[PDB]
Design a protein around this ligand. Sequence first.
Ligand SMILES: Nc1nc2c(ncn2[C@@H]2O[C@H](COP(=O)(O)OP(=O)(O)O)[C@@H](O)[C@H]2O)c(=O)[nH]1
Ligand SMILES: [Mg+2]
Length: 179
Amino acid sequence: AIRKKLVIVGDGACGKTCLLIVFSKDQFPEVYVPTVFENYVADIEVDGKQVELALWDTAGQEDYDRPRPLSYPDTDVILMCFSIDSPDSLENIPEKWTPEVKHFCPNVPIILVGNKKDLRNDEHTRRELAKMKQEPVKPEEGRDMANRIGAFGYMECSAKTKDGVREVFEMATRAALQA
Ligand SMILES: Nc1nc2c(ncn2[C@@H]2O[C@H](COP(=O)(O)OP(=O)(O)O)[C@@H](O)[C@H]2O)c(=O)[nH]1
Ligand SMILES: [Mg+2]
């Protein structure tokens, strides 16, 4: 297999760990783990190519003992995530994650990923955002942000329902394979 390294970044609680675990293990987790610490290397075939994809989960600022800069060397593709239930997590894409990723991983392809797509039509989510004069992120807003940051693509998924999960990793693998 062709070997590639994937790093996932984005705001705390936007669904990074659950996305990796659903992709890797095909089951939504029952216990809470801030960052996947088991070594996961996933086998995936795309366009008739066998690829081994190392999945590197990342910690928040508060985890000073496991700092994120150590994750960036030799990265082949980035998943840069926000949550569709959190317009705040989208605004951090240009203001925090893109400056960080492009600093440490110049010229590495980025897939922008909108997580928790199942919450777009969730009424608890709608009600809570409405009290803040907010609403769920629209797909067009994600695509616009993908243009702004020079992402290779924009994808939406739900780790909870599995919708779009495989496709995220397939797109990321295709990006990582580009010469
Ligand atoms: N509704 C919904 N909740 C999700 C989804 N993915 C994760 N969550 C929840 O969001 C919270 C944060 O998820 P986690 O993967 O730990 O986020 P991380 O901090 O980015 O690693 C947890 O309560 C998860 O159960 C999803 O696709 N849909
Ligand atoms: Mg996590």
